[PDB]
Each structure stands twice: as structure tokens, then as C-alpha cells.
Amino acid sequence: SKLPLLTENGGRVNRVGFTRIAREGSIHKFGFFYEFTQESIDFDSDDGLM
Amino acid sequence: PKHYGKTIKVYEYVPLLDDRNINDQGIDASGATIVNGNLYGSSKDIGNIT
Numbered sequence: 804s805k806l807p808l809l810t811e812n813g814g815r816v817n818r819v820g821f822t823r824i825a826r827e828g829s830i831h832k833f834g835f836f837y838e839f840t841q842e843s844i845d846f847d848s849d850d851g852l853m
Numbered sequence: 854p855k856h857y858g859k860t861i862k863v864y865e866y867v868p869l870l871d872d873r874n875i876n877d878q879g880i881d882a883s884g885a886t887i888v889n890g891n892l893y894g895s896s897k898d899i900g901n902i903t
Contacts (some may be wrong), residue, residue, distance in 0.1 A: 850856050 871895055 807817035844852055860901045872895040879890030893902045 845855050846858055848856050848858075 869894055874891040876890040879887040881887045896902055
């Protein structure tokens with residue numbers, strides 16, 4: 804029922820259109836940290852703690 | 854030094870002839886077991902020492 808049949812007379816028949824889409828992504832920020840005192844590394848048994 | 858906590862410990866070695874040398878190793882001159890293993894300890898009495 805939707806075939807682009809064309810007659811001998813031509814004319815403005817079977818005009819089509821096009822479209823495009825836009826994709827998108829974004830970045831976000833992350834991070835974490837830890838704290839320590841001088842005594843927690845100086846008096847700690849393990850010198851390789853850090 | 855580092856990595857040994859905050860406490861310092863040291864041994865004191867009591868002399869053989871001391872009243873606070875309390876041990877159960879005592880065997881007397883005749884071979885009998887005695888309650889003291891420090892000979893006469895801190896005694897200064899001639900009778901006890903003899």
C-alpha cells in the first residue's frame with residue numbers, strides 16, 4: 804500500500820524526508836582521601852604502613 | 854627508636870646474695886632441699902652465715 808509507484812506523467816509524487824538524532828554523554832568528578840598523624844606512623848610497629 | 858610504641862622496658866638482675874632473690878633452686882650443703890636458694894641472702898649475722 805505504500806510502494807512508490809510512478810506513472811508516466813511524473814510530477815510531485817513520492818517525496819521523502821530524513822532525520823538525525825543526537826547522542827550525548829558527560830564526565831563526573833570522583834575522589835577520596837585518608838588522614839593520619841605523625842605518631843601513627845612513627846610509633847607504629849610497621850615502618851612500611853604508608 | 855621509631856616503631857616501638859612509647860614505653861621502654863629493662864631488666865634488673867639481682868645478685869645471688871640478696872634477700873629479694875627468691876627462688877626454689879636451693880639445695881643445702883648436705884644435699885637436702887631448702888626453701889631458699891640465695892644462701893644467706895642479705896644476712897649479716899655470723900651465726901646465720903656460718
